[PDB]
C-alpha cells in the first residue's frame, strides 16, 4: 500500500525521469529458470569469468552462485548485464574459464570439476540474455530526485531512494527512512539504480521506506 504518485506529492518531490538511467524504458523479460548455468565475471575477482548457477529469480534479476563456491557470496545480476553471458562465450572468444575465489576443493582439481559440472547441465540459452541498454551521454540527475535502488549492503533488496548530491559523473544515493550507513555513491549510469515504477513493471518487490 505504498504508491509513487502519492509519495511524491506528499514529499513535494519528483522522480528521476527514465532517461537519466542506463536501464531500458521497457524493462527486459527474465525467462531464466533456477538451475540454469551461465558464465559470470567473478564479483570478487573481475579479471575472472567463472561458471555460475541460477539460485533464484526475482524480477529482471538473477541470484547467482559461482559453481564450486560456498553459499555465502551469492550475487544478483540483471538479465541485461554485460557481466553475464551464455556458457561457451569464453571458449568462443578464446578466453579461459577460471575457478572462483571461494573455491572449496584443492586447486589442482579444477579441470576435473569443470568437466563434472558442465556435463548434462541446463545451459541458459543465448536468447535469454538481453541487449545492454545504452549509456545516457550526460548526468541528468538533480538533487532530491526520487528513484528505486539496490541496497548495496543487502542487494536482494530494492528500496525507495533519493539523490542527495550530484558531482560530475557521480550521484550520492540515500535511502528514505534509513541512516547514512546505507548511503552510497555510484556513477549516474550504474545498473543498481532504477526509475520509479521498475519493480511494478518487472514484478520485483519494492521495499517500503524505513519510517
Amino acid at each position: 500500500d505504498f504508491h509513487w504518485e502519492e509519495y511524491l506529492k506528499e514529499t513535494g518531490s519528483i522522480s528521476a525521469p527514465s532517461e537519466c538511467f542506463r536501464q531500458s524504458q521497457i524493462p527486459p523479460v527474465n525467462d531464466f529458470k533456477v538451475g540454469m548455468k551461465l558464465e559470470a565475471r567473478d564479483p570478487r575477482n573481475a579479471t575472472s569469468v567463472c561458471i555460475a548457477t541460477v539460485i533464484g529469480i526475482t524480477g529482471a534479476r538473477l541470484r547467482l552462485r559461482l559453481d564450486g563456491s560456498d553459499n555465502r557470496n551469492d550475487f544478483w545480476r540483471l538479465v541485461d548485464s554485460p557481466d553475464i553471458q551464455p556458457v561457451g562465450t569464453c571458449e568462443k572468444e578464446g578466453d579461459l574459464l577460471q575457478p572462483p575465489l571461494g573455491y572449496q576443493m584443492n586447486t589442482s582439481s579444477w579441470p576435473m570439476f569443470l568437466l563434472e559440472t558442465l556435463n548434462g547441465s541446463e545451459m541458459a540459452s543465448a536468447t535469454l540474455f538481453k541487449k545492454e541498454p545504452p549509456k545516457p551521454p550526460l548526468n541528468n540527475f538533480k538533487v532530491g530526485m526520487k528513484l528505486e535502488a539496490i541496497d548495496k549492503k543487502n542487494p536482494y533488496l530494492i528500496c525507495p531512494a533519493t539523490i542527495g548530491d550530484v558531482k560530475g559523473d557521480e550521484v550520492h544515493i540515500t535511502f528514505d527512512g534509513w541512516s547514512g550507513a546505507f548511503d552510497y555513491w555510484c556513477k549516474y549510469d550504474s545498473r543498481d539504480i532504477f526509475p520509479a515504477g521498475w519493480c511494478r513493471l518487472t514484478g520485483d518487490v519494492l521495499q517500503p521506506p524505513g519510517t
Partner: peptide, 8 residues
C-alpha cells in the same frame, strides 16, 4: 502502534 522496520 509502530515499531521501526528491520531489513528482510
Amino acid at each position: 502502534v509502530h515499531r521501526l522496520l528491520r531489513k528482510g
